[PDB]
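Translate sequence into structure tokens.
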Amino acid sequence: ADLVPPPGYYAAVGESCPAVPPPYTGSLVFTSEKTFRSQIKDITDMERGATKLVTQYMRSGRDGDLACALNWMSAWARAGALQSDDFNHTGKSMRKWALGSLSGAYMRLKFSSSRPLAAHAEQSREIEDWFARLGTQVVRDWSGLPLKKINNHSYWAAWSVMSTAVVTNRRDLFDWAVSEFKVAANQVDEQGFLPNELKRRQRALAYHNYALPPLAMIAAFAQVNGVDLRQENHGALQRLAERVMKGVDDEETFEEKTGEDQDMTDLKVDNKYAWLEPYCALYRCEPKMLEAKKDREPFNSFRLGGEVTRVFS
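Result follows.
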């Protein structure tokens, strides 16, 4: 049967157009900060602008908004943007993040019970082929790695692929994302830690928290296509999630494991707990987990397709 997203992505619509950043067709050889931000400017201007044009069409229904979202994505699609075989770790990291954001947003157009795309067949097909080509490329980018190398980058890659899988109806890509999810569930030790993110020393809590959104989104998407991943490695996802919340409350447990006082800069912002939306859709959340969900809504996370609250509701 055809791959589907969670119920929320079938939401009805409602219920000019700036010039498109030059499509990035270059080699993806970037610097991992002011330099980095500048090298990836057209990619950043794309991922934010397209997502916000989708968001605003889904809210407003105005038919110019749709035209503009599809002109933006189909320009990049038609041009073969981010397809290069010349890449470094940072450029392949950028390919998958951009796939992640744009496919996550376009999902709402693709599956809305309004059928916005019924009028835009050609441009829609240009965009789905582009996402499938990028999805096939991401798979190559993060395959044949030993456990020592499999970390947050592989998890977010697996989400970008899953998002692509459902948009393009590609079971090959679905299956890859589920396997990657399985590897990641197995990385979760008896205590709910990921050894590789324990290497991040003072950032190990932040990086543990950064792993939950991709993994929870993959579990949410797998479940609506009949693949329940909630009990993987004795409920590893729930084990990792619980452990992350004990840590954000009480830092000490991570300081004890890493021997290091934890930087709480990336546990500050509300966007960074958006994983509570798909997680509490999957697991019976306790009042400490539902309260953190209640007070920070509604979540906007570009990297997950924008309005995450609206699609888990």
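Note: The chain has one domain: 7-311.
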